[PDB]
Amino acid sequence: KVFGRCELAAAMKRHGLDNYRGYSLGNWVCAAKFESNFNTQATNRNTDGSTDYGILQINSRWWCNDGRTPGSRNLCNIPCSALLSSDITASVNCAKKIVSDGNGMNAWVAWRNRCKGTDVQAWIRGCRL
Question: Domains of the chain (ranges plus CATH)?
Fold first, then answer.
């Protein structure tokens, strides 16, 4: 499923991400944007050998089991491919765990590299929420 920006912000807010663990909604929307799109089925391969899966760009090193890398810690207890669902609930739940268990959003590679330091609230401006 593809979302538009405000559509996705509204869905993430409905799922409790606004201000979760201290992070305003735009942080989460920011880290979802990949290859010019918001797509539940997207994957981003990284040069460190890991891959970011799905709408919330969850990284396979620690958080999900990609089925290929031996010794995967799989902290969200989910196959990575299962984060490519049309319903965002599993991805939300895993992202909440990243930030909570990982002690802040520096634990989320996509956000750390692509969103940290920017005016993240721009991602939710102009939307019904």
Answer: 1-129 (1.10.530.10)
